[PDB]
Amino acid sequence: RWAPIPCSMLENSLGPFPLFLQQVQSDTAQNYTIYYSIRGPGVDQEPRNLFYVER
């Protein structure tokens, strides 16, 4: 498995929010009806809903 792509977020900003970070999507979206989901620390674990995805 090859390396991850990084993304960088600056501190104590005024936004406007939500502030964009990253975009990935399943190459099957032109093939099935798909939506995207997130879990880990920073959303479903503390600190909670710190990051969000658009499904």
Which residues bind to other proteins, rule: CB under 8 A?
17-18, 49, 52, 55
Q: Least distance from C-beta 52 to other proteins, angstroms?
A: 6
43 vs 41: CA distance, rounded Å = 6
Q: Give me 54's structure tokens.
A: 């658009």
In contact, 55 and 35? CB cutoff 8 Å: yes
Q: Least separation, in Å, of the C-beta of 18 and other proteins?
A: 6
Cβ closer to other proteins: 3 or 19?
19
* Least distance between other proteins and beta carbon 36 (Å): 12
The β-bridge partners of 41 are 45
